[PDB]
Design a protein around this motif. Sequence first.
Motif, PDB file in Angstrom:
ATOM      1  N   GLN A  87       0.820  -1.203   0.000  1.00 53.13           N
ATOM      2  CA  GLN A  87       0.000   0.000   0.000  1.00 53.13           C
ATOM      3  C   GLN A  87       0.855   1.254   0.000  1.00 53.13           C
ATOM      4  O   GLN A  87       0.537   2.224  -0.690  1.00 53.13           O
ATOM      5  N   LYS A  88       1.943   1.262   0.769  1.00 49.90           N
ATOM      6  CA  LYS A  88       2.845   2.408   0.732  1.00 49.90           C
ATOM      7  C   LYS A  88       3.410   2.638  -0.659  1.00 49.90           C
ATOM      8  O   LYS A  88       3.394   3.762  -1.186  1.00 49.90           O
ATOM      9  N   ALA A  91       0.736   3.873  -2.986  1.00 50.39           N
ATOM     10  CA  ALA A  91       0.386   5.258  -2.704  1.00 50.39           C
ATOM     11  C   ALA A  91       1.388   6.206  -3.334  1.00 50.39           C
ATOM     12  O   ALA A  91       1.014   7.187  -3.984  1.00 50.39           O
ATOM     13  N   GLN A  92       2.676   5.929  -3.143  1.00 53.06           N
ATOM     14  CA  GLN A  92       3.693   6.796  -3.728  1.00 53.06           C
ATOM     15  C   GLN A  92       3.641   6.759  -5.249  1.00 53.06           C
ATOM     16  O   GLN A  92       3.795   7.792  -5.911  1.00 53.06           O
ATOM     17  N   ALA A  95       0.657   8.824  -6.336  1.00 55.85           N
ATOM     18  CA  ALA A  95       0.885  10.244  -6.097  1.00 55.85           C
ATOM     19  C   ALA A  95       1.880  10.820  -7.093  1.00 55.85           C
ATOM     20  O   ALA A  95       1.783  11.998  -7.453  1.00 55.85           O
ATOM     21  N   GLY A  99      -1.115  12.251  -8.692  1.00 61.82           N
ATOM     22  CA  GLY A  99      -1.424  13.017  -7.508  1.00 61.82           C
ATOM     23  C   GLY A  99      -2.170  12.184  -6.479  1.00 61.82           C
ATOM     24  O   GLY A  99      -2.768  11.148  -6.780  1.00 61.82           O
ATOM     25  N   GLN A 100      -2.139  12.668  -5.244  1.00 61.64           N
ATOM     26  CA  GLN A 100      -2.767  11.960  -4.139  1.00 61.64           C
ATOM     27  C   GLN A 100      -4.272  11.890  -4.348  1.00 61.64           C
ATOM     28  O   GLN A 100      -4.937  12.917  -4.509  1.00 61.64           O
ATOM     29  N   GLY A 101      -4.803  10.674  -4.351  1.00 61.09           N
ATOM     30  CA  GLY A 101      -6.198  10.449  -4.645  1.00 61.09           C
ATOM     31  C   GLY A 101      -6.517  10.308  -6.113  1.00 61.09           C
ATOM     32  O   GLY A 101      -7.698  10.341  -6.478  1.00 61.09           O
TER      33      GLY A 101
END
Lengths: 110, 66, 31, 67
Positions: A87-88, A91-92, A95, A99-101
């Motif tokens: 997940q980390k 996520a990176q 992003a 972008g985040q989300g």
Amino acid sequence: GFHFQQYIAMAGRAINPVQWTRAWRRMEGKSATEVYRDALAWTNNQFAQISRASQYRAWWWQNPLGMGLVLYGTYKAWHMIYMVRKQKKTAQLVAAAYGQGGQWLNPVPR
Amino acid sequence: PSGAYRLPAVDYKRQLSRGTLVEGADFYLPTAQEQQRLARHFEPYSEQEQEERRKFRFQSISVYLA
Amino acid sequence: KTLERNVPMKEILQPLWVVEPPNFLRQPVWK
Amino acid sequence: MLNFIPKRCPSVSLLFGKRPVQRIEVGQARHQLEIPVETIEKIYEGVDSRLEYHNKDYNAMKWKDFM
């Protein structure tokens, strides 16, 4: 559940390159069916040890939930070690890519 | 209609009045070998059948996996 | 004569089979 | 009763045929009963050795004789 320390030690031996040469040598005159049957027999031996010894014996971790708590803790450890690590990284990645989300964005309005 | 292709059954009320109705056996046993097993008492299964049945004492997790 | 061979426990105590469950029907799944 | 005949090997049943008699306790009062070892050995002609259960310490008879 039992022998978690022995399982860690087994993993430690497995990750050793010397043991890789040892397994290469042990694989002489050997079949995949034999290896699979050996592993299945080992796993059956473990679970049969559990099924037998739980009838009369209690480990240091015995609790009013029994082995349910030990199995839950094994699961949670696996989760936090592997899935949360993934997940980390995901996520990176997201992003950096959007972008985040970015994966939950709405479709472009028409 | 002629009556050749009539309904091949009789209503349960008429059967009950005739004394003919049977209610049981949601399942069945097709072969007489399978029907007379509990009455034979000495060879419920032939020897060949026994050795064939002995191959399915457990389910095959290997085959499930494959 | 004296015993000198190293006797493993698998020659004495056999573990039960529990990895794959029993088939009390003794028939395959497709059947 | 079960179709579980103990193996007469000494690793399982120590001292099976060392004497010509077997003994058993019967019921809640545990009445004694003595049986000739030949009467017992009659079972091991019907015993089937392919089948082994309970730590491979008990064989099974043929169903005809058992029944």
